[PDB]
Amino acid sequence: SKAKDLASLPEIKSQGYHILFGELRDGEYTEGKILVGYNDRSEVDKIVKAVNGKVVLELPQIKVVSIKLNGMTVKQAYDKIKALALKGIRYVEPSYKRELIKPTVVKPNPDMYKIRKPGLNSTARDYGEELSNELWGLEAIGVTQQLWEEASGTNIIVAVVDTGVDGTHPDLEGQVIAGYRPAFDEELPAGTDSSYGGSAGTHVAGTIAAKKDGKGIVGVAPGAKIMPIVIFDDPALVGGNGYVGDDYVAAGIIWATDHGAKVMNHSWGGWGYSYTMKEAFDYAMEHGVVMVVSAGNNTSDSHHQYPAGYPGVIQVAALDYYGGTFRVAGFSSRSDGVSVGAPGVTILSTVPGEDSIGYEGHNENVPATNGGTYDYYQGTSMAAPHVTGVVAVLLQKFPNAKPWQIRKLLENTAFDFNGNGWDHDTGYGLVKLDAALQGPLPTQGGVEEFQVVVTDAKGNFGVPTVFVSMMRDNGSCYYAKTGPDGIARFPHIDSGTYDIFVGGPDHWDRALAPYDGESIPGGYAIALRMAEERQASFVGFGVSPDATQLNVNFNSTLQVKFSTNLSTLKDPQFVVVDPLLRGVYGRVAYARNQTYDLSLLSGQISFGIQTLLPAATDITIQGTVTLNGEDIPVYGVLKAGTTWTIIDDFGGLNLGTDSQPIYVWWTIFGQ
Numbered sequence: 084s085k086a087k088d089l090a091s092l093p094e095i096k097s098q099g100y101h102i103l104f105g106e107l108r109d110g111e112y113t114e115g116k117i118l119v120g121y122n123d124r125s126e127v128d129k130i131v132k133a134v135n136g137k138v139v140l141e142l143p144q145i146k147v148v149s150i151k152l153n154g155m156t157v158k159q160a161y162d163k164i165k166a167l168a169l170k171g172i173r174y175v176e177p178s179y180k181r182e183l184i185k186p187t188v189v190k191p192n193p194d195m196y197k198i199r200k201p202g203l204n205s206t207a208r209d210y211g212e213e214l215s216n217e218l219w220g221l222e223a224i225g226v227t228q229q230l231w232e233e234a235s236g237t238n239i240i241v242a243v244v245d246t247g248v249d250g251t252h253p254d255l256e257g258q259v260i261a262g263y264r265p266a267f268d269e270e271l272p273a274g275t276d277s278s279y280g281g282s283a284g285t286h287v288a289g290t291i292a293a294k295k296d297g298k299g300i301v302g303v304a305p306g307a308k309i310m311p312i313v314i315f316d317d318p319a320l321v322g323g324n325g326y327v328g329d330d331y332v333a334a335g336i337i338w339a340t341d342h343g344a345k346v347m348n349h350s351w352g353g354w355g356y357s358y359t360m361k362e363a364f365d366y367a368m369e370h371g372v373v374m375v376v377s378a379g380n381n382t383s384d385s386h387h388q389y390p391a392g393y394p395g396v397i398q399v400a401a402l403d404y405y406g407g408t409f410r411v412a413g414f415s416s417r418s419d420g421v422s423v424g425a426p427g428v429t430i431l432s433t434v435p436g437e438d439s440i441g442y443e444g445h446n447e448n449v450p451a452t453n454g455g456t457y458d459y460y461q462g463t464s465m466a467a468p469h470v471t472g473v474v475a476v477l478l479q480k481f482p483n484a485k486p487w488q489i490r491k492l493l494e495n496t497a498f499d500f501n502g503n504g505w506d507h508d509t510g511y512g513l514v515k516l517d518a519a520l521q522g523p524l525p526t527q528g529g530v531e532e533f534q535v536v537v538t539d540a541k542g543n544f545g546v547p548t549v550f551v552s553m554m555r556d557n558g559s560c561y562y563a564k565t566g567p568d569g570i571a572r573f574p575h576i577d578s579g580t581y582d583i584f585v586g587g588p589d590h591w592d593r594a595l596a597p598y599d600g601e602s603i604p605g606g607y608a609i610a611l612r613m614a615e616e617r618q619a620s621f622v623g624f625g626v627s628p629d630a631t632q633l634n635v636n637f638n639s640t641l642q643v644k645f646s647t648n649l650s651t652l653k654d655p656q657f658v659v660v661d662p663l664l665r666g667v668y669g670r671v672a673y674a675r676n677q678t679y680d681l682s683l684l685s686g687q688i689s690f691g692i693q694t695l696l697p698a699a700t701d702i703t704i705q706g707t708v709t710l711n712g713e714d715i716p717v718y719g720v721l722k723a724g725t726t727w728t729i730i731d732d733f734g735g736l737n738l739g740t741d742s743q744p745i746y747v748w749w750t751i752f753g754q
């Protein structure tokens with residue numbers, strides 16, 4: 084609703100907090116499209132009309148609708164939405180930029196993991212395939228033909244979320260089942276070439292499940308099946324670098340989950356924290372699917388934070404072997420989130436053939452006799468598939484395992500080659516399939532879900548975009564942002580003791596020119612000022628199946644005092660109003676130099692002044708707002724001929740329009 088007169092506005096109850104908008108960072112997001120997380124699908128139609136956009140994807144499984152903007156930027160769409168006063172919308176965000184953590188080619192190395200490594204004599208690498216001698220990674224993780232006799236991934240479907248897979252490769256015959264190309268809602272028939280984005284996905288597929296048939300190589304889980312999900316498509320068809328967008332990736336993840344995938348392999352990422360992607364990953368894990376994600380690609384590219392950074396995933400580091408010891412590959416991003424490391428250097432696997440869609444070259448010296456093409460790659464993207472393969476084998480033996488149990492089993496059985504037990508480079512060590520398969524499956528060490536719920540003082544409204552950091556001296560740290568209901572969810576994380584830090588709404592909507600100057604907030608963030616941020620710390624908090632939730636109650640103080648003499652005005656009153664002018668929270672006689680204490684109010688408000696009779700001349704009204712102890716000057720101008728005005732640190736600023744107003748607001752949580 085809108086308003087024209089302040090004195091005529093009715094009294095209303097707290098309206099909660101502002102709509103949750105995804106942070107906008109130059110060069111970090113795709114232009115012309117918005118992803119809308121909703122509760123009430125009908126409310127999305129109010130956004131479609133406001134931006135006159137077109138719905139291009141509906142994902143009811145996670146209540147998301149993607150809207151194409153048709154000649155408007157994301158920022159402009161936010162401007163059309165920010166003052167609409169929607170109630171059943173969870174968030175509005177762009178699709179963020181993501182890149183594949185690209186593997187690089189390396190030359191074969193006959194000495195790799197040899198000489199006093201781990202049994203390099205008398206059929207050391209006897210897997211039955213002609214190229215077995217070169218599969219040092221299988222030897223490193225403890226694979227043996229005898230082990231496959233017990234478990235090999237039978238009936239387990241593995242989703243390779245990547246560039247697509249050349250299912251026509253001879254070493255993948257019978258191994259690639261029906262998949263999905265979300266960009267075009269196109270089903271990919273079993274055994275077909277879907278390598279639209281290049282060679283990576285095929286290399287991944289071979290490491291995981293190349294066929295055990297005496298020829299070429301063999302995967303970690305030769306009994307498993309590969310379900311290709313194309314998220315890096317042909318850039319000539321989808322533009323950019325081929326990334327299909329956070330919305331289409333979510334569609335692909337949902338499709339894979341709905342169609343039976345029990346583990347997915349991911350080696351891509353970007354800086355943007357996406358609520359949509361969080362929802363998709365959590366959807367898959369809630370359905371019991373394990374999500375393996377490669378650790379970052381390097382330092383220069385401080386991106387690829389997500390999806391690797393979402394709590395619950397199994398993050399994998401790349402391991403090399405030289406000088407008789409395992410070691411982090413180097414290009415592997417160091418992070419406390421790394422669970423385990425796996426072979427990721429000189430990994431021989433399947434690549435698309437010369438006339439296949441995703442051909443990117445091959446090593447012609449590989450002595451294969453099946454007419455197939457192979458190449459040696461290095462990278463964290465070469466390590467993750469080893470772990471995905473190990474998970475597939477484990478899921479055959481422990482069909483009832485929950486994702487946290489699979490991750491803890493891997494960490495509990497990893498080979499600590501460094502001797503320190505755990506570190507930010509390789510987590511708990513080298514993944515070991517043989518030790519992991521022995522089990523048993525852990526019954527303790529993790530929780531299906533831990534939540535941190537942040538609300539205002541009385542616990543009436545959840546506070547959105549509050550950062551929640553779970554830190555500890557050793558082990559993985561976790562991070563998540565609260566959603567519209569104030570909840571930050573942590574699925575399948577470790578049980579144990581953490582130091583948990585919570586930080587007030589995120590004030591990313593700066594009001595100063597990046598080039599060092601003065602500006603104005605767009606009104607996109609929940610809070611407009613650093614002074615509104617609240618913090619809480621809970622040291623030694625114990626997370627376990629008996630303590631799965633932490634409730635945090637924010638509080639604040641707010642006082643306002645005006646210094647201007649308004650004796651020339653008729654019955655001047657100080658008014659606390661809704662920023663959208665939907666109504667008022669209270670009116671009181673104006674008193675110069677009188678301090679009004681609003682510390683008990685919670686939510687988002689604006690300040691105004693009204694008079695019974697119109698002002699004869701312009702009058703500037705000035706005051707001081709003391710917010711959480713910080714003094715902030717405020718002012719506004721009551722124009723001649725008018726009976727009301729707004730007062731704030733920007734002079735009484737409407738961030739919206741006359742028709743759809745949204746005045747600068749003050750974010751508080753009560754007491």
Ligand SMILES: [Ca+2]
Pocket residue numbers: 212254293294295296297298299300301
């Ligand atoms: Ca083979």
